[PDB]
């Protein structure tokens, strides 16, 4: 990631993947 | 009544001491005269290897260790009472051997 | 050398700044008193903490101490 680009979207696209998993990982256990 | 010996061995002491303790409790409220637990001199398992996978650099060494501790318990009780104590005080860390 | 660090210096002086009256110019009672006031994970650290605490009180008695 040496460019001026691909790191703005290297963070926000990366963090929404985690934000996509916190929601999912909290759905499987509560509704068990 | 029977002259029976029980040995407790493990690598970790909090697990080892717990198994030692409640068995002794099982011989407190039960009026069974008790000998033990006998804290055996600890045996340290050491091996001295070389840090370098190859043979370059400083001469430095890795000294790993294991500490194994033994507790032997002497019992004067029937075979049924001695056997049920171990399954009450079974816990994965300690292996339990009973010898008459 | 026997120079105290900041984690034992600032932790000790907060004790004076909050519990000045019940401390005393004696280590052992201070040693037992600091055992009940602050949660200390190690007894060596508490003996380090309590030691500077009494020494500060010895300084407070003989004059005005700076920073407390």
């Amino acid at each position: 990631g040496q460019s001026d680009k691909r790191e703005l979207e290297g963070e926000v696209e990366g963090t929404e993947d985690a934000e996509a998993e916190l929601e999912a990982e909290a759905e499987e256990n509560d509704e068990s | 009544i029977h002259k029976i010996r029980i040995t407790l061995t493990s690598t970790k002491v909090k697990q080892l001491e717990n198994v030692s303790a409640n068995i002794i409790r099982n011989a407190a409220q039960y009026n069974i005269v008790k000998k033990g637990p006998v804290r055996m001199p600890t045996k340290v398992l050491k091996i001295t290897t070389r840090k370098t996978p190859n043979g370059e650099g400083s001469k430095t060494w890795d000294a790993y260790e294991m500490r194994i501790h033994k507790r032997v318990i002497d019992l004067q009780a029937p075979a049924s009472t001695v056997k049920r104590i171990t399954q009450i005080t079974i816990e994965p860390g300690v292996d339990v051997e009973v010898t008459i | 050398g026997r120079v105290r660090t900041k984690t034992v210096k600032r932790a000790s002086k907060v004790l004076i700044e909050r519990f000045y009256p019940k401390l005393t110019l004696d280590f052992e009672t201070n040693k037992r008193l600091t055992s009940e006031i602050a949660v200390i994970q190690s007894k060596r650290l508490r003996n380090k903490i309590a030691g500077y605490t009494t020494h500060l009180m010895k300084r407070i008695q003989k004059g005005p101490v700076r920073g407390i």
Binding site: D17, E21 | - | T7, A11, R18, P21, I37, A38
Partner: protein, 223 residues
């Protein structure tokens, strides 16, 4: 086979080590975390920890049946001597094990490293882990080998607590160009510890003052 006490608990470790290695190779795709061997009378309980306990013990528990059978035939064990159960991990982000292979699957799909590296970091920070650091070193479209460390949150580095609050998992994800080695270092919060120490050695927690009460000169209270 009679064995000495020194060579008995050593064999238990080597058996546990070799058994633990086999599960990593065999059940990597289900996010296998670790193995617990709870010795018990008349049974050898083996607890397999994985994120996905449905792929393991799947299609009416077919896989676990052909797994525990693969075990008894190498360890000279009777068929009734072992019983294996599968349990789902409580915190996937807090476990540095599962996220390491979870990173491995994401790495293999060609995703850019910046998107992949931060994709798990915020998940560990989602789980409440006090800190996390991921290191990727090797080659990517270039001959020269370089390293990139992505640290976040609080870190401890030296001393005894590094064994109590830090768990690590190193994997080499297979690339067509060479070897890419990774390291994932994650800390459970000291306040979240239930077994060892609950805080750092230098953590000094001061209680608050009980003073500022009113005292009256000299009464007597008779109850």
């Amino acid at each position: 086979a009679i064995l000495s006490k020194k060579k008995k608990l050593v064999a238990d470790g080597v058996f546990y080590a070799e058994l633990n290695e086999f599960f990593t190779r065999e059940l990597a795709e289900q996010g296998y975390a670790g193995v617990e061997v709870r010795k018990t009378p008349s049974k050898l309980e083996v607890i397999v920890k994985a994120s996905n306990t449905q792929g393991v013990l799947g299609e009416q528990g077919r896989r676990i049946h052909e797994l525990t059978s693969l075990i008894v035939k190498r360890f000279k064990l009777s068929p009734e001597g072992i019983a294996i159960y599968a349990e789902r991990v409580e915190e996937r982000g807090l476990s540095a094990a599962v996220q390491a292979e979870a990173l491995k699957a994401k790495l293999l799909s060609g995703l850019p490293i910046r998107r992949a590296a931060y994709g798990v970091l915020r998940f560990a920070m989602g789980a409440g882990a006090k800190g996390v650091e991921v290191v990727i070193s090797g080659k990517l479209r270039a001959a020269r080998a370089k390293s990139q460390k992505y640290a976040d949150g609080f870190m401890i580095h030296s001393g005894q607590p590094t064994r109590d609050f830090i768990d690590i998992a190193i994997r080499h994800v297979l690339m067509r160009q060479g070897v890419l080695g990774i390291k994932v270092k994650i800390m459970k919060d000291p306040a979240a510890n239930r077994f060892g120490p609950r805080a750092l050695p230098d953590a000094v927690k001061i209680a608050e003052a009980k003073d500022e009460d009113e005292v009256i000169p000299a009464p007597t209270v008779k109850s």
